[PDB]
Amino acid sequence: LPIDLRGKRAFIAGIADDNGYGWAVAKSLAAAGAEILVGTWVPALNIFETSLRRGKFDQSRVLPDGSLMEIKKVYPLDAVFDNPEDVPEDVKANKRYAGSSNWTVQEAAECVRQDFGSIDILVHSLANGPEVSKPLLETSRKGYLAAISASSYSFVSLLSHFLPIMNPGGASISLTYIASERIIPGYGGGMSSAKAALESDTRVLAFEAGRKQNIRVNTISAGPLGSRAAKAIGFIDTMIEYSYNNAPIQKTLTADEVGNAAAFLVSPLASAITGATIYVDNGLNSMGVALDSPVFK
Amino acid sequence: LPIDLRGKRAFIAGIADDNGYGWAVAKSLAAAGAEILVGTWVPALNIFETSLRRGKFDQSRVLPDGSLMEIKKVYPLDAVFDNPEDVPEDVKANKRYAGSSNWTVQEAAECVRQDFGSIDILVHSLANGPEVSKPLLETSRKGYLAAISASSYSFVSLLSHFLPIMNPGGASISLTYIASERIIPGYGGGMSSAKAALESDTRVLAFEAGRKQNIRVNTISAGPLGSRAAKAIGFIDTMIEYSYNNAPIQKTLTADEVGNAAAFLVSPLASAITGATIYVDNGLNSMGVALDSPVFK
Amino acid sequence: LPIDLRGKRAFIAGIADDNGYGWAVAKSLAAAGAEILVGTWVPALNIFETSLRRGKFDQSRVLPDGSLMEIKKVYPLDAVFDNPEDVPEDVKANKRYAGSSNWTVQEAAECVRQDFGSIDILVHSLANGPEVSKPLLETSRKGYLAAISASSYSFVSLLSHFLPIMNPGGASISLTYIASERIIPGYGGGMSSAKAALESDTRVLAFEAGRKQNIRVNTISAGPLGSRAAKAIGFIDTMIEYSYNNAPIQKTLTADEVGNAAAFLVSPLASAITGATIYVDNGLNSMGVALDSPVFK
Amino acid sequence: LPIDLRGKRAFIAGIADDNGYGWAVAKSLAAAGAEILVGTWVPALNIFETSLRRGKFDQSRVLPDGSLMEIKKVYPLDAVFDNPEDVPEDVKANKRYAGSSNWTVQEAAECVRQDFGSIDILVHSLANGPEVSKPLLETSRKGYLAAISASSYSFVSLLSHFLPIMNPGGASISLTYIASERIIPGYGGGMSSAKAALESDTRVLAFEAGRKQNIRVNTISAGPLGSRAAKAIGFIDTMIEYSYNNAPIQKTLTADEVGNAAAFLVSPLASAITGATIYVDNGLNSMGVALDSPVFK
Ligand SMILES: NC(=O)c1ccc[n+]([C@@H]2O[C@H](COP(=O)([O-])OP(=O)(O)OC[C@H]3O[C@@H](n4cnc5c(N)ncnc54)[C@H](O)[C@@H]3O)[C@@H](O)[C@H]2O)c1
Ligand SMILES: NC(=O)c1ccc[n+]([C@@H]2O[C@H](COP(=O)([O-])OP(=O)(O)OC[C@H]3O[C@@H](n4cnc5c(N)ncnc54)[C@H](O)[C@@H]3O)[C@@H](O)[C@H]2O)c1
Ligand SMILES: NC(=O)c1ccc[n+]([C@@H]2O[C@H](COP(=O)([O-])OP(=O)(O)OC[C@H]3O[C@@H](n4cnc5c(N)ncnc54)[C@H](O)[C@@H]3O)[C@@H](O)[C@H]2O)c1
Ligand SMILES: NC(=O)c1ccc[n+]([C@@H]2O[C@H](COP(=O)([O-])OP(=O)(O)OC[C@H]3O[C@@H](n4cnc5c(N)ncnc54)[C@H](O)[C@@H]3O)[C@@H](O)[C@H]2O)c1
Whether the Cβ atoms of residue C288 and residue A182 lie closer than 8 Å to each other: yes
Amino acid identity, position D149: S
Task: Give residue C85's region: left, alpha or beta (phi > 0; psi -120 to 50).
Answer: alpha
Enumerate helices (H) and strands (E) in chain C, giving the number of each: 10, 7
Strands A73-77 and A35-41: parallel
Q: Give the DSSP per-residue string, B27-79.
A: HHHHHTT-EEEEEEETTTHHHHHHHHHHTTTTTTTB-TTSPBP---EEEEE-T
Which candidate, B104, B107, B90, places its Cα nearest to that of B42?
B104
Q: Does B196 touch chain A (CB under 8 A)?
A: yes
Which-ligand-closest: CA of B199?
2
Amino acid identity, position D191: M
Cross-strand bridge partners of residue A166: A119
Whether the Cβ atoms of residue A171 and residue A217 lie closer than 8 Å to each other: yes
Residues flanking ligand 4, CB < 6 Å? D 14-16, 20-22, 41, 44, 77-80, 125-128, 150, 175, 177, 222, 224-225
**The dihedral formed by the CA atoms of A5, A9, A10 and A11, expressed in degrees to the nearest 10:** 180
Q: Does B168 touch chain C (CB under 8 A)?
A: no
The CA distance from C250 to C259, in Å, is: 20
- Helix segments in chain A, DSSP class H: 21-31, 45-54, 89-93, 95-99, 105-116, 141-148, 154-162, 191-213, 235-246, 255-265
Whether the Cβ atoms of residue D258 and residue D198 lie closer than 8 Å to each other: no
Q: Does A137 touch chain C (CB under 8 A)?
A: no
Residue C195 annotated as lining a ligand binding site: yes
Which residues of chain A neighbour C246 with C-beta distances below 8 Å?
290, 293
Which-ligand-closest: CA of C179?
3
Q: Give the DSSP per-residue string, B145-178.
A: HHHHIIIIIHHHHHHHHHGGGEEEEEEEEEEE-G
Q: E strands of chain D, at which residues?
A: 9-13, 35-41, 73-77, 119-124, 166-176, 216-222, 277-280
Q: E strands of C82-214, at which residues?
A: 119-124, 166-176
Residue C160 annotated as lining a ligand binding site: no
Residue identifier of the C-alpha nearest atom 1 of ligand 3: C177
The size of chain C, in residues, is 297
The CA distance from D268 to D3, in Å, is: 8
What letter would DSSP give residue A220? E
The CA distance from B42 to B13, in Å, is: 12
The CA distance from C243 to C246, in Å, is: 5
Q: Residues of A at the annotated binding site for NAD(+)?
A: 14, 21, 78-79, 125-126, 175, 195, 225-229
The CA distance from D32 to A264, in Å, is: 14
Amino acid identity, position C276: A
What are the backbone dihedrals phi and psi of residue C285, each rounded to the nearest 5 degrees, phi first? Answer: -55, -25
Total number of domains in chain C: 1
What are the backbone dihedrals phi and psi of residue D171, each rounded to the nearest 5 degrees, phi first? Answer: -165, 160
**Nearest chain D residue to C201, by CA:** D193
Cα within 13 Å of Cα(A191), Cβ side: 21
PDB resolution in Å: 1.9
Q: Which residues, 6 or more positions from C276, have their beta carbon under 8 angstroms from its beta carbon?
A: B278, B279, B283, B286, C202, C206, C218, C219
Q: Which residues, 6 or more positions from B254, have their beta carbon under 8 angstroms from its beta carbon?
A: B225, B226, C272
Q: Does B230 touch chain D (CB under 8 A)?
A: no
Whether the Cβ atoms of residue C289 and residue A290 lie closer than 8 Å to each other: yes
Cross-strand bridge partners of residue C35: C9
For the Cβ of B42 lying below 6 angstroms from any atom of ligand 2, the answer is no
For the Cβ of B79 lying below 6 angstroms from any atom of ligand 2, the answer is yes
Cross-strand bridge partners of residue C75: C39
For the Cβ of C222 lying below 6 angstroms from any atom of ligand 3, the answer is yes
In this structure, is the dihedral angle defined by the CA atoms of residues D87, D90, D96 and D100, taken in order, positive or negative? positive
Which candidate, B90, B161, B139, B123, places its Cα nearest to that of B262?
B123
Distance B287 CA to ligand 4 centre (A): 24
Q: Which residues, 6 or more positions from B101, have their beta carbon under 8 angstroms from its beta carbon?
A: B76, B107
Q: Give the neighbours of chain B: at least 3 Cβ pairs within 8 Å.
A: A, C, D
The size of chain D, in residues, is 297
The CA distance from B201 to B197, in Å, is: 6
Q: Does C208 touch chain A (CB under 8 A)?
A: no
Elucidated via: X-ray
Strands B119-124 and B9-13: parallel
Task: Give residue D275's region: left, alpha or beta (phi > 0; psi -120 to 50).
Answer: left
Q: Which residues, 6 or more positions from D27, have their beta carbon under 8 angstroms from its beta carbon?
A: D60, D61, D63, D69, D255, D259
Whether the Cβ atoms of residue B275 and residue B219 lie closer than 8 Å to each other: no
**The dihedral formed by the CA atoms of B55, B56, B59 and B60, expressed in degrees to the nearest 10:** -110
Which-ligand-closest: CA of A20?
1
The CA distance from C264 to A246, in Å, is: 37
Q: Give the neighbours of chain D: at least 3 Cβ pairs within 8 Å.
A: A, B, C
CATH of the domain at C135: 3.40.50.720
The CA distance from B285 to B76, in Å, is: 35
- Residues spanned by the domain of B154: 1-297
Strands C73-77 and B277-280: unpaired
